[PDB]
Write a protein that binds this ligand. Structure first.
Ligand SMILES: O=P(O)(O)OC[C@@H](O)CO
Ligand SMILES: [Cl-]
Length: 168
């Protein structure tokens, strides 16, 4: 109620604050990570998420990668209870100029959609992966059509660009 998304489109809400406050206020069950393929969270949003978990995310990721194949853009694996009652799914998105940049992204959002509970997710493969926002948003917006979802908006730019993208 008393922290309001700066924009709501359908069942989808957009919040730009810092991660602690938001996660604390929204009480999500799954937090989505804009992930590597090899789960190295060295900057951007995945860095934040990791710190947020006191690095427990990284810890789990390494282990994960010693009995499991790296992650193909277009997919996601969920780590349950990374912190108590908080799960992270690492969704790897496409880098700008792979094949089916679009159909990959879509699957990601599709995976994100199937998760149970309240979700908070950054906009996918839109940072150092360099896919333009219009596309990711468009994918997400198009793919997850009937589900409450909370997009974490990570920077002032992400914000402006999202503003434009809703020009009515
Ligand atoms: O997928 P994006 O959002 O572009 O970021 C990749 C990131 O995991 C590198 O640290
Ligand atoms: Cl950064």
């Amino acid at each position: 109620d008393l922290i309001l998304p700066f924009y709501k489109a359908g069942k989808v809400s957009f919040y730009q604050g810092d991660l602690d406050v938001l996660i604390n206020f929204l009480e999500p069950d799954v937090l989505v990570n804009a992930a590597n393929g090899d789960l190295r969270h060295v900057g951007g949003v995945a860095r934040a998420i990791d710190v947020f978990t006191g690095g427990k995310l990284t810890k789990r990721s390494k282990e994960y990668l010693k009995s499991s194949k790296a992650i193909a853009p277009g997919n996601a694996v969920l780590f349950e209870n990374v912190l108590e009652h908080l799960s992270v799914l690492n969704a790897v998105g496409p880098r700008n100029g792979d094949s089916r940049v679009e159909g990959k992204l879509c699957n990601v959002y599709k995976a994100i959609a199937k998760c149970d509970g309240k979700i908070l997710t950054p906009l996918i493969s839109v940072g150092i992966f360099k896919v333009k926002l219009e596309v990711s948003l468009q994918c997400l917006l198009k793919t997850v059509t009937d589900r409450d979802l909370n997009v974490f908006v990570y920077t002032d730019q992400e914000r402006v660009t999202i503003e434009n993208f809703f020009n009515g």
